[PDB]
Amino acid sequence: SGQQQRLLAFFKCCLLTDQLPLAHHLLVVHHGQRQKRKLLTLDMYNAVMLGWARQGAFKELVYVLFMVKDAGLTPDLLSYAAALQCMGRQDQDAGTIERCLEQMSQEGLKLQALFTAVLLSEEDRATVLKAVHKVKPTFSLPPQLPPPVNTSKLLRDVYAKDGRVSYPKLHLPLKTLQCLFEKQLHMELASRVCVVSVEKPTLPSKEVKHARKTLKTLRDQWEKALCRALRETKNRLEREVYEGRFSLYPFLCLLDEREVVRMLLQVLQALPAQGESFTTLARELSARTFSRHVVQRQRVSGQVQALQNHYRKYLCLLASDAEVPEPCLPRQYWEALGAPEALREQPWPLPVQMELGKLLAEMLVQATQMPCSLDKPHRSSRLVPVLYHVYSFRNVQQIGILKPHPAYVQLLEKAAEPTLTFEAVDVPMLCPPLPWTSPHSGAFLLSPTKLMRTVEGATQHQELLETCPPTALHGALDALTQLGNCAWRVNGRVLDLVLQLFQAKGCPQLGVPAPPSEAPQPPEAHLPHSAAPARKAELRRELAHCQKVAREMHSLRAEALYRLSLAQHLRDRVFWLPHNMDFRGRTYPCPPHFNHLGSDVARALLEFAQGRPLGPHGLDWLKIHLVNLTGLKKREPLRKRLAFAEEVMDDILDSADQPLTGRKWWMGAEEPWQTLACCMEVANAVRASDPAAYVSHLPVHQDGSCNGLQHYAALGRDSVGAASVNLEPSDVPQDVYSGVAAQVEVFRRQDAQRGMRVAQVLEGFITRKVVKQTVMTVVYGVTRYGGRLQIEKRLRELSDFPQEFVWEASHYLVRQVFKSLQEMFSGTRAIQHWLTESARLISHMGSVVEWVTPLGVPVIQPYRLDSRKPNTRKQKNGFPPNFIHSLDSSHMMLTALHCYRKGLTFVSVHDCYWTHAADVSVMNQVCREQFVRLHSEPILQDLSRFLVKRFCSEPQKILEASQLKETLQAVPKPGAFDLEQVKRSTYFFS
Amino acid sequence: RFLRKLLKPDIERERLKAVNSIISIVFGTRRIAWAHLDRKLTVLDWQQSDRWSLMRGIYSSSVYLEEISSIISKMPKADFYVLEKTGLSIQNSSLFPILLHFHIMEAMLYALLNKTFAQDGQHQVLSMNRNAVGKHFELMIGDSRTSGKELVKQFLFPRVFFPSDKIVHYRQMFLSTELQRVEELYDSLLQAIAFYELAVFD
Amino acid sequence: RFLRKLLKPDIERERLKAVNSIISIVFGTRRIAWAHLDRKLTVLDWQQSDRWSLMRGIYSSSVYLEEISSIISKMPKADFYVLEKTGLSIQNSSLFPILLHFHIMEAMLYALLNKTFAQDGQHQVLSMNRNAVGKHFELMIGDSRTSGKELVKQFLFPRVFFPSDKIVHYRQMFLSTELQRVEELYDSLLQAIAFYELAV
DNA sequence: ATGGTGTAAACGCCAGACGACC
RNA sequence: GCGGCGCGC
DNA sequence: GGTCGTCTGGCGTGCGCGCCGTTACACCAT
Ligand SMILES: Nc1ncnc2c1ncn2[C@@H]1O[C@H](COP(=O)(O)CP(=O)(O)OP(=O)(O)O)[C@@H](O)[C@H]1O
């Protein structure tokens, strides 16, 4: 129950905090209680046994065994492990050891199984093995002599020991990377990092430094008072133990008072001018105490030195001046040479988590007293609290908040304070990350990271990942590690220009915001007398409009300031970005503020740290990428694109030399800043003696046509539609969303004759973009309401008319030309139906949908009704969109795995692949081989067989089970088409 | 002049000078509370009412009338019933379900609890502005009102008299609010004391 | 199938089978009106209020109690009191003042008319769906109701059973149906006829 | 320079519940 | 979690 | 006890990140 959960959490925490000798006076007193002795022998006796087995002891485990015997429960072969572990570090007379061995042999217990069942530490296991071998040296077992190797058909060539392979290395020596690792370790032992802001400060004054000085002495006084209050409350809470129970103070005694006062003074500076939720503050305090405890326990246990030694050994595989006896994958090399062990920490339940946050919140406000009003007179000289409780309305509910004092806010606003704060995990790593070897082992040095992103709860994905054998996940773990081992650096000229525009009034058309000083002003003021009855209403209506614009401007400038300050911090450095995945297999980076899945400015400040010479064919790909990023032409072959770049050489030179002075040609492109970076790179490459010897750092992008559709045409082979999405070879690229538009608009050229308002107001507004998303989603689940909601927003930004009824558009494609859409795309809808009917019949029997990807990753859907019943509509509308989004990720991971074997730098956005200018063709061949490898196996038959085995096994009733059987056994017939034609298509991922 | 803003009905001062008992009512979105006084600052009744069926998405007058009748059954007889009035208005686009809940509770307690109004036309239920009560006790900062739990904690642990019959009950109520504070229970005593000190006992 | 959506409160069928009189009340922004019947479809009283000091500015319980008590003191005594229920939505950002007025007056009427509720717990005031009566009279266009002056013009000026003494007064009252749009408040008699036709 | 303070009334559809079924 | 916004595939 | 055919209501193509504010605004005459 709740109290059992509280005691289990308390004991499991305090054995980790080295406070078990302090907490030994709780279970004894609670067992002395008669009525409260229930829920005490369940799962906490082995916890204190393991904690006693962690460190040395002298006749301390006799009490545990006596209490277990008095309770009359089964020791379950875990107390004996603790006894063997504590038998070391002490002289043993071998007294009645034969009796102990007989007791081990009797009572149905056997050896060679508790070493993994008890799951002690490596030191404890070694001590137990030594104590066993000191008496009986015959018993000894090896864990595993050969490492497991995958045997699947799609992953047979990667793990094969034959053939010659080339593996890339880093560009930095060993000592430099050792110092970088030391810098990141010292940066991450501190939980926060301070960054100077970007805004321009002017005119300090005497009252400014007076406010700074009174802030300093106030903070010193608060620190002393907070330390005294912590000491007094700890002394008060220590007294209640011997005549009470459930001491909450050991969790407080975990952290030193300096850490507590630091986090409490640094959390007050970020508290807003208005109040905050009291429960949210309690949650934040408990979460931050947990996060600090993790790093403190990791650094006090000696794990840091072992990790440093292993990292220094492992770094020779990446170093530029070191050699290895045999090359291998990073995961296999970390698996060899030894490995550390994951903590596998379990979070404590809510009653012990929120109560201590409440306690710290009550501690902070009571013991912080500002010297009365902070005005210029000092006549009062009284002590009043800085914070007060205020009962308020927020959302649609009454909520109590914790509000500051107006004098404190006025004091804080008077200073400049160009310092910004950041969490450590929000910034990129300054050292290469850890490899992915398990769902538990991660990428950061000290902070644990989850492999599957979940919004809230959703423990079924983790259970499915842990249930499958470990060899299945190797092909995804290797891809995640390879994407994590890419080194980056910051472009400088672009950052300087961006800061120059940022300091002086901004430029909102380039994506950089504008300051609140240039917010719009009302055209007319307000008059008290009612000069006109209509004047007052319009005055209210147009003076209630500017505030929303000002608030939006404030939000945009805040986020841009954060991003630019973090970018400015990482100048003249090299950094790294790890990766994770969601529940359908797609991959994302961990640091949110600054990565490559962002806007144009976030992508134009990133460059490859290691450079490659252009080679014979490196400059042409740069010009093709420049034309691609311009976005002027997306329908022509590569020759016609590279021809265009030679005509704008003067514009490239003028934009590279004087950006903001001369002709601003790089403005007006779809991606201006990326275009400017590419122009600078190309101009530097051109003005050289030998262009083919120039070292370049700019990534080149290759994207796929329509990846969701492209998988449909091979799950069942279609000679129609494959040509539509370029799966089959052709000279000029073929567009689905462009060809749909011509039929969709054919009627309006010849129907405004009957006469309609919506038809003749448009006049050429229709394009590829306006219908792109709706035409994309028709293959997936879509309704007319979502189509209208999509089309309305696209009509909003276009400014020609505010008569926004978008129904002509939603019906015209999903309905009037929908048959034209069936005629345009047909036979892909049979699976779209078959899978939806199968999902419907599974859901009516009360079951969620689960399956396995062709690589081996198991995938499940979490939609449940408000244990709980399956939501039928949400699990039949989401299955087709969530089935293709696993296969595309499988294709990406196979392409990455076979691209790494030839020595290439590979980083991937969904559907778009990035590489050096000299390494494009190899990736283009690997992608078109791996698509055929992936889609030549029968996918729908295996899916049908897994569905039948998982669902149609039970003969509970004849009718529903039989109907499920004949729906799952019925499969659409694949068409006559061969998959050996992908290898010669030029625009498949181009 | 000040009594125009303090109390909303306009009542002649002679009948205020001879009042005997007063009950103060504070509404909430999840509870109601009330207290009783007997001109010697002697507290006799002070209770709350939790576990409602209202404010859960249904606004039907049948359950309102059943719940109000159950609450009004235990309320004893008195010369006046003073009521708490807030500063919410119709102008807020949100916070309208809260306002709709408050006006229904006020109107039904105003239509009930005034038994003889149809005969002689004497009012017996009246409002009191909450900002004025906070300013009397100096609980106002930043154009807002603070909690007031520390004031009533000092009283319970010459301003107000206190018998021994309900002292342990309210100290248990103080301990319950230490775990989870509620201000509907605390605003009742402050409003009653402010009434005996402004309108009566000049 | 109907009585679960006709009447908002729940009551036994036998009590609805045995009735003797109903008072039907319909309110609005400017005034109210009511009518009386006597179990054989025979009118006895049919009145309306002139004007108010309400709904002009602020909302106060004192003026509401004054006006409601002053109006109710003229009511006759009957068996069941039935009042309309308009289905406005909380979700609509507009129509808040009229909704607040309607809910306040519904609560006041339920409070003050349901006499002897504390002793005997039987409900005496009921809420009827307006769209249901609109469908029964079939004047609904599917989204709104039309004017109901046609039925009262056809019935007045063999089953109507108008008493002979009240003909001249009712005719004099109806002769002033050319201003203030008071004829829309004549749906009280229609709702009473509908109740007698769906309760027996 | 400052608080004081007032016065502001836009539509389909399919799948779970409900009065009638047995 | 509610509301207003903005970005990526 | 078990149905239960039908009739009324509530979401509406799938996944992932960031910022802000809880109506103040405006008037006031000292
Ligand atoms: N709005 C949306 N709704 C549903 N799925 C979407 C989506 N946008 C993207 N996707 C998914 O992501 C895939 C990628 O679509 P895109 O690669 O952007 C086609 P595109 O031709 O590259 O668009 P573009 O021409 O504007 O770049 C789709 O096939 C689909 O699976």
Ligand SMILES: [Mg+2]
């Ligand atoms: Mg694409």
